[PDB]
Amino acid sequence: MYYGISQFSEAYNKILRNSSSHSSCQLVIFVSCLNIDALCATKMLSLLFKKQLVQSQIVPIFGYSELRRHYSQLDDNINSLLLVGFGGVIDLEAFLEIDPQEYVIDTDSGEQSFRRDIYVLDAHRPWNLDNIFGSQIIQCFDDGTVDDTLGEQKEAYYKLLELDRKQRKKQIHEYEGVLEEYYSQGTTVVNSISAQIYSLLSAIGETNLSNLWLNILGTTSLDIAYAQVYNRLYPLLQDEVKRLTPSSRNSVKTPDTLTLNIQPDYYLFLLRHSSLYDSFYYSNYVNAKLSLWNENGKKRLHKMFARMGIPLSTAQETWLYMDHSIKRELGIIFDKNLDRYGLQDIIRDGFVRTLGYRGSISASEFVEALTALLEVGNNSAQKLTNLRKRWVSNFWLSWDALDDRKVELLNRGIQLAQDLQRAIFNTGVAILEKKLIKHLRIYRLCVLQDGPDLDLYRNPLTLLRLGNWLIECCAESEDKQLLPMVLASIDENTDTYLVAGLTPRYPRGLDKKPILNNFSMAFQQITAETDAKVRIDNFESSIIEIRREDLSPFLEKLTLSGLL
Amino acid sequence: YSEWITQPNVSRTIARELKSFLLEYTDETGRSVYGARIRTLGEMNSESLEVNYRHLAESKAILALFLAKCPEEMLKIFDLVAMEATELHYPDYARIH
Numbered sequence A: 001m002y003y004g005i006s007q008f009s010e011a012y013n014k015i016l017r018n019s020s021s022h023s024s025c026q027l028v029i030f031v032s033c034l035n036i037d038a039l040c041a042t043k044m045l046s047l048l049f050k051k052q053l054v055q056s057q058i059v060p061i062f063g064y065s066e067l068r069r070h071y072s073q074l075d076d077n078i079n080s081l082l083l084v085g086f087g088g089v090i091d092l093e094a095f096l097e098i099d100p101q102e103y104v105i106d107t108d109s110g111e112q113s114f115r116r117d118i119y120v121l122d123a124h125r126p127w128n129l130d131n132i133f134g135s136q137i138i139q140c141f142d143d144g145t146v147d148d149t150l151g152e153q154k155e156a157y158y159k160l161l162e163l164d165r166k167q168r169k170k171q172i173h174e175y176e177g178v179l180e181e182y183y184s185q186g187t188t189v190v191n192s193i194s195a196q197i198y199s200l201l202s203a204i205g206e207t208n209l210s211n212l213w214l215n216i217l218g219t220t221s222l223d224i225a226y227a228q229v230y231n232r233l234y235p236l237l238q239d240e241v242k243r244l245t246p247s248s249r250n251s252v253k254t255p256d257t258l259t260l261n262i263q264p265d266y267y268l269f270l271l272r273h274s275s276l277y278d279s280f281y282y283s284n285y286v287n288a289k290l291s292l293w294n295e296n297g298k299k300r301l302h303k304m305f306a307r308m309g310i311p312l313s314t315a316q317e318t319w320l321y322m323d324h325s326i327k328r329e330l331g332i333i334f335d336k337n338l339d340r341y342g343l344q345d346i347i348r349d350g351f352v353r354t355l356g357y358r359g360s361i362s363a364s365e366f367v368e369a370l371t372a373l374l375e376v377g378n379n380s381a382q383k384l385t386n387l388r389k390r391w392v393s394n395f396w397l398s399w400d401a402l403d404d405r406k407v408e409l410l411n412r413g414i415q416l417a418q419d420l421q422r423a424i425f426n427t428g429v430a431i432l433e434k435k436l437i438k439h440l441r442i443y444r445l446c447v448l449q450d451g452p453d454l455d456l457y458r459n460p461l462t463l464l465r466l467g468n469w470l471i472e473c474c475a476e477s478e479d480k481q482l483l484p485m486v487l488a489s490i491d492e493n494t495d496t497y498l499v500a501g502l503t504p505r506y507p508r509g510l511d512k513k514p515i516l517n518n519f520s521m522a523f524q525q526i527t528a529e530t531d532a533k534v535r536i537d538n539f540e541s542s543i544i545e546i547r548r549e550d551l552s553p554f555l556e557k558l559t560l561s562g563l564l
Numbered sequence B: 001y002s003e004w005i006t007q008p009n010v011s012r013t014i015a016r017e018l019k020s021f022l023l024e025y026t027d028e029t030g031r032s033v034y035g036a037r038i039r040t041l042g043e044m045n046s047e048s049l050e051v052n053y054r055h056l057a058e059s060k061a062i063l064a065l066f067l068a069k070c071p072e073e074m075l076k077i078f079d080l081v082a083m084e085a086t087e088l089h090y091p092d093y094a095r096i097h
Helices: A005-019 A036-051 A064-072 A145-149 A151-162 A166-182 A193-204 A209-220 A227-244 A276-281 A284-290 A295-308 A324-341 A363-376 A380-400 A404-433 A460-475 A519-529 A548-558 B008-024 B033-043 B053-057 B062-069 B071-087
Strands: A027-032 A056-061 A080-084 A117-121 A138-140 A258-264 A349-355 A444-448 A485-491 A496-502 A543-547
Touching (some): A005 A117, A036 A056, A036 A193, A036 A363, A117 A193, A151 A166, A193 A209, A209 A227, A227 A258, B008 B062, B008 B071
Antiparallel strands (some): A496 A543
């Protein structure tokens, strides 16, 4: 459909034809900040437009309210827009207040052209049909979803668009019935935005190891929450590492050799940058298998190190200084022992980059560093705006850390990630010890009223770290039914709760068709029904804000909702 | 006793008896108390195993007698038996102590 995978070169050549001149800046990229995949996509896409000498402006955007503000004030000379990581699921023609008649030029002939193009690079679904069919200005990129999945919706969309009494009743309610089933699907991410732009670089003939690393980083960020998607794309990344890696083997290490191997990348927290003990203690997956919040879980961890034959005094050494024999024997120690605890799934092959003599970083460890930069790198309308300014300001810390010249900023990130995961854990234990997860039949509720350094959880990403930790913890327990989870946290200064709706997921080794985030409808439909004050402006529309006293009325109508 | 405890067939018999004390003795409640001590030994990475003399006087009491009469030879065996009793539980604990 709009631009299928076969025809990304035509959309790119259309950008060059429309927006390349030495006279002016003509291209704007709007990127959702608070999304690593949109960050790695936009980094690749800027290195491309650098090499083509296309004068461009990148604007990081927090949410839909800022998208309208920034679009409203675009200089009329700007004739191409990229919307990277958002806007596929909203009607952009309605939302931005477009009327195509104010944008059309050279209408002659079975023909149109327009003074602006709006290219949507988005991996979320269900796609809004008035973008994918119902507009000539908005120009979505596709992984293949539309031709493979939307053929009944295409037909239903047009027969209903054409039809502006038995023969009518018999058909208008068939086609509205197809759209009414197409909406009333929950949200999901089905691709990485970076693997889409790498398949565009593959069409132009621009692939190299720097663009491949950004493709691996952008795609790795999915693994925590969309494991089913990482596993589709992972086979395709292995082939590209082989294709681009040079001939030499048994090579001497030199300050200039970049090597991007595929090798064991254990599912542990910041292994190469922390101790072997903290690697297990702060891992989501390990915590979920050993029940590691309570002190019998901590006994199971020591009892494992003792049985592996690693002293606690060695396991706690920083991984560089930990001894040369353990670090090469470790593959054999894990292949012997992890099976006893069911930790067998920790063995994984991943992508490991090392540059010169500065020591290896895995794609997993690098996205933990880049997210920690977005999260903590630095009158309610001012109290929101001077906070959303901070989250736009952090985007450029994560951006600059993608550069190899700036390893000191990556090393800030790798320290911040270890400060965060410790705070997530010290909060996640409080929730499980104090029994704060209430079972409400339709969903599970959790609400942080008070606690130490609670002022972290007002960033949408840090709330999702704690969400993904509580989800892994539940998803491995064999007695619990899988249920949607609502996680709420107060800001004592704004006097709102940040509320996040979370999908459950299957245990990390079991191998089904996906499950979808329908809080994105349930929150809108309850909001439209109530007189309560909320914000529904975030790009991940599973996340909302609500004033303190309105929350209990809101949850009281959420449990009644048939939409979950 | 010094000359008895050191004879090789006697030493082997003493070792097996002390091993069987740690493996087979259970509490008044029925829990394996020296299993609970060995769990705590290897988890703490502790090098020292507490044993209660009453538990020898209540079972295999000749070992309690030899231990009082010539500990410098008896503990020299019961340290090896305790190493093997913990190594049954934590293979390669030899790399730790």
